[PDB]
Ligand binder design. Sequence first.
Ligand SMILES: COc1ccc(-n2nc(C(N)=O)c3c2C(=O)N(c2ccc(N4CCCCC4=O)cc2)CC3)cc1
Length: 126
Amino acid sequence: SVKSEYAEAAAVGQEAVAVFNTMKAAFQNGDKEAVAQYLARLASLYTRHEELLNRILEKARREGNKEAVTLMNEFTATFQTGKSIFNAMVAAFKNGDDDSFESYLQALEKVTAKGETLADQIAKAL
Ligand SMILES: COc1ccc(-n2nc(C(N)=O)c3c2C(=O)N(c2ccc(N4CCCCC4=O)cc2)CC3)cc1
């Protein structure tokens, strides 16, 4: 249902944010093993998140919920903007580029804040 998919997306989204924050703290402390394993976890969560939203969107469209469909389209563009920065961050880390990695973190952090706000809005709109 819209409700069971939404609740799972919320969990998956919260997990992705928490893992990102844990990964950031690890990096500032020079814990690279930890960092890479979180990158694998984050990418995984992002894929599961996209699949859930694609299903909620279809249900939102079918019930005529133009407000959710609009918000979900803003969240998804925002999410995909952040996901492009994440990809470059993974390519950098594997290349030993710490400086590039730190800059990507800050940028991703700021995109993430935009998605969090839109998340709060989607909750009220579905
Ligand atoms: C139908 O669509 C949604 C959308 C959002 C939710 N949802 N619910 C909650 C909650 N109940 O708290 C949360 C989310 C969520 O997705 N959150 C999040 C995930 C990922 C990002 N990122 C990651 C890096 C790239 C940028 C970016 O935006 C930002 C925010 C915040 C937590 C449910 C259903």
